[PDB]
């Protein structure tokens, strides 16, 4: 078998995911009225609306070697030159030194030229341009997303558009939010699209919107707003959650959520809203399902469920429970007082509540300490390799990088293994003494498509930039992941390919049956007579920490 390759692009920042941090676990339990039970937490339905938008812009530069900037394209040029004929006007207008100025392509004359598809781009992010003073016209199709407020929508490039995607004039959408002058927007009725790759023209009309931002022109199809779905969505069904009362506020804790919620001790009147049919129905249905799964044989329900609004925008549904052993103590004590109703009886017998408070207290503290141990370790690995940590946290291969203290994320494009080829050598002939640290690769996004140049990354990743170069060494030997198996390289030359099952695996935590042997270092004689560094494998943490120390010494020498 062979795994699919991935060409992960660099995220621009359209999607930023903050990540949780450690907490202050109490040294000794202090919460009152401890109790276990089932819970279902609901998150605010952000209602993400995704759509594709076309971006237009031009580039202008001076041939003397200066003054390079970007500017948008007017509306008439997009709907007449580009839409009707797929061509861009040669002349371009811009502001230079706070003064109106113009330019032309090679200063030839006022003419028109057709647009051509981008050389590499992506199959899902098609783009076009007029050329691979100088003027260039560029048109690109990118994705866009909007949230419940629908006041702004972010493009795939990371730039926000302060305007509602549903704004228009066809269906009285003038009331929609907008932050641009009336002269900066235009809507066309009966508009027909034209795929520049084929120029076959659209088959049916689609009203098109057009906006001109200070840096580019954006256009998207105006679609009526869909009916609003339920305002809340099930975030996660908690199998077990402990509730504690302290400081006039409840405290909910779990082992899987890794977060503590706080409420005002008053049940939110869910009945006040007619959405109970969406939340009350889904919530109650989950309580019985979880209860029948494991609590039907050992626990008993205590009254009807409860709903509370927690800090951060979460709605927590609750169903307090108590073990059969604790139930025996309550009924036994109740019989003494008599000389069946668990509600309005729990927390009454202080002597019976004293041991359970301490018992459940250790469980809550244990989860908090364990979660802090995992959170601090997870956060460190996240900074060390956001690609692997981001991919596992979402269940699919994903690209990500840290934009300071927040992590930007984007999706990766997969490519089949039969569409990639690896070069036979990793040495660069342009300059001796330097060679690529990883094998070079050439591939195509799809079968029969154009070939592109790139470099092999980690975990079948395909890098579009060939920059992983390093001073070369003697006795080189490395294994690189390539599809299902591995590709072996020695002395910066392709040797052969081997499968995944041809190498010893240590899947288990501890394996003492490794038939290892005392390796004897064998260095070529050129290391002594020519003083050329010998191979040392990838840099260990101390090696990189020690390697930069030498750089400081070299700088001091200089």
């Amino acid at each position: 078998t062979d795994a699919n390759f991935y060409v992960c692009p660099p995220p621009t920042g359209a999607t930023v995911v903050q990540f949780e941090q450690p907490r202050r676990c109490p040294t000794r339990p202090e919460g009152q009225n401890y109790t276990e039970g089932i819970a279902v937490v609901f998150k605010e339905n952000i209602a993400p609306y995704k759509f594709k938008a076309t971006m237009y812009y031009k580039d202008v530069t001076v041939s003397q070697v200066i003054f390079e900037d970007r500017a948008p394209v007017p509306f008439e040029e997009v709907i007449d030159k580009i839409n009707a004929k797929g061509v861009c006007r040669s002349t371009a207008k811009y502001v230079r030194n706070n003064l109106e100025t113009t330019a032309f392509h090679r200063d030839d004359h006022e003419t028109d030229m057709e647009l051509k598809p981008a050389n590499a781009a992506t199959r899902t992010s098609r783009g076009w341009h007029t050329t691979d003073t100088t003027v260039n016209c560029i048109v690109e199709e990118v994705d866009a997303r909007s949230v419940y407020p629908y006041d702004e929508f972010v493009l795939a490039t990371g730039d926000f558009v302060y305007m509602s995607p549903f704004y228009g004039y066809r269906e009285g959408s003038h009331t929609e939010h907008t932050s641009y002058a009336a002269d900066r927007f235009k809507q066309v009725d009966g508009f027909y699209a034209r795929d520049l790759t084929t120029k076959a023209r659209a088959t049916a009309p689609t009203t098109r919107n057009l906006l001109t931002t200070p840096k580019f022109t954006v256009a998207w199809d105006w679609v009526p707003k869909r009916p609003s779905v339920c305002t809340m969505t099930k975030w996660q069904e908690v199998d077990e959650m402990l509730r504690s009362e302290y400081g006039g506020s409840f405290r909910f804790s779990s082992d899987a959520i890794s977060t503590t919620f706080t409420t005002n001790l008053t049940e939110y009147p869910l009945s006040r809203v007619d959405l109970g049919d969406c939340i009350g129905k889904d919530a109650r249905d989950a309580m019985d399902r979880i209860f029948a799964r494991r609590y039907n044989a050992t626990h008993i329900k205590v009254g009807q469920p409860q709903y509370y609004l927690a800090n951060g925008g979460f709605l927590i549904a609750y169903q307090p429970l108590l073990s059969n052993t604790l139930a025996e103590l309550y009924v036994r004590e109740h019989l003494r007082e008599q000389s069946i109703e668990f509600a309005r009886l729990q927390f009454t017998y202080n002597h019976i509540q004293r041991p359970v408070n301490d018992m459940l207290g250790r469980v809550a503290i244990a989860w908090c300490e364990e979660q802090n141990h995992e959170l601090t370790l997870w956060n460190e690995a996240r900074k060390l390799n956001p690609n692997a940590i981001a991919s596992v946290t979402v269940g699919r291969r994903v690209s990500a990088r840290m934009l300071g203290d927040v992590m930007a994320v984007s999706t990766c494009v997969p490519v089949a293994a039969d569409n990639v080829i690896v070069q036979n050598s990793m040495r660069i002939s342009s300059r001796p003494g330097a060679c690529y640290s990883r094998p070079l690769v050439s591939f195509r996004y799809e079968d029969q498509g154009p070939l592109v140049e790139g470099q092999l990354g980690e975990n079948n990743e395909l890098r579009l930039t060939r920059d992983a170069i390093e001073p070369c060494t003697v006795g080189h030997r490395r294994y690189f992941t390539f599809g299902g198996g591995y590709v072996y390289f020695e002395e910066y030359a392709y040797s052969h390919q081997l499968s995944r099952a041809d190498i010893t695996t240590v899947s288990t935590f501890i394996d003492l049956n490794i038939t290892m042997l005392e390796d004897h270092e064998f260095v070529p004689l050129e290391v002594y007579t020519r003083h050329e560094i010998k191979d040392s494998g990838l840099l260990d943490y101390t090696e990189v920490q020690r390697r930069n120390q030498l750089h400081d010494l070299r700088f001091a020498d200089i």
Partner: antibody, heavy 115, light 107 residues
Framework: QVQLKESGPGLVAPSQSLSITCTVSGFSLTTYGVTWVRQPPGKGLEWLGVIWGDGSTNYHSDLISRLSITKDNSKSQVFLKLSSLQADDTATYYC?????????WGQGTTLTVSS | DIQMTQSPSSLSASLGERVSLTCRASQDIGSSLNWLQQKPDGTIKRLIYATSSLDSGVPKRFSGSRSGSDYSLTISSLESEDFVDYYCLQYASSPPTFGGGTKLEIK
């Protein structure tokens, strides 16, 4: 300009599966959706479902178990399906586009369920 | 779901008389409300969309407005053809729901 026309059997037996096709022109189905509405004799209108530009669809809670809608973008036709038809299913079915919110409506087809 | 209540179920008026209808929503729907008209043969036509925005080509006599949680439709002068059915419709929350309907008859 936008127009919609329905096409169905007109008469069907109870407990069988219904099939109605609505031909629409004036807008692309790849971007806009189509909604279905019915009206029994002497009663008000009733919403059935809707199919947006994408493959997503929404159905009424009283007909989700039996209602099903599909489409073809090349032919600009939307197919309506309804299984396990009862006696009270006799009603005039209409297909209403989303070029607007409910701007254009079709003529409608009168369907009767009886053996 | 949002339930729409239309009143009156029926109305009596003379030719050229000024009448008005009202439709109330159980929950907030904003400006997302439309008024429809059905011909005797079953043809459905939209009159007002998005709360008081006259439809393309609709007669000027038709109109609409909002008053708090109540939405209304008004006809300046009634003609012999306007004596047909009318229905209020909402589309703010899923699923859209129609009103109870109103029939206009001669006085």
């Amino acid at each position: 300009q936008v127009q919609l026309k329905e096409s169905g059997p007109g008469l069907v037996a109870p407990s069988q599966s219904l099939s109605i096709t609505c031909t629409v022109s004036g807008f692309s189905l790849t971007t806009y959706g189509v909604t279905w509405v019915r009206q029994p004799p002497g009663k008000g209108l009733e919403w059935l479902g809707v199919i947006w530009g994408d493959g997503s669809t929404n159905y009424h809670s009283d007909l989700i178990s039996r209602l099903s809608i599909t489409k073809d973008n090349s032919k600009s036709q939307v197919f309506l399906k309804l299984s396990s038809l009862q006696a009270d299913d006799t009603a005039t079915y209409y297909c209403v586009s989303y070029y607007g919110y409910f701007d254009h409506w079709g003529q409608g087809t009168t369907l009767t369920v009886s053996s | 779901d949002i339930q729409m209540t239309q009143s009156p179920s029926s109305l009596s008026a003379s030719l050229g008389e000024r009448v008005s209808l009202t439709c109330r929503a159980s929950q907030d729907i904003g400006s997302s409300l439309n008024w429809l008209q059905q011909k005797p043969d079953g043809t459905i036509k939209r009159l007002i969309y998005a709360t008081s925005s006259l439809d393309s080509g609709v007669p000027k006599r038709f109109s609409g407005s909002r008053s708090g949680s109540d939405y209304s439709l008004t006809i300046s002068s009634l003609e012999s053809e306007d004596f047909v059915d009318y229905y209020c419709l909402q589309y703010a929350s899923s699923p859209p729901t129609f009103g109870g309907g109103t029939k206009l008859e001669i006085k």
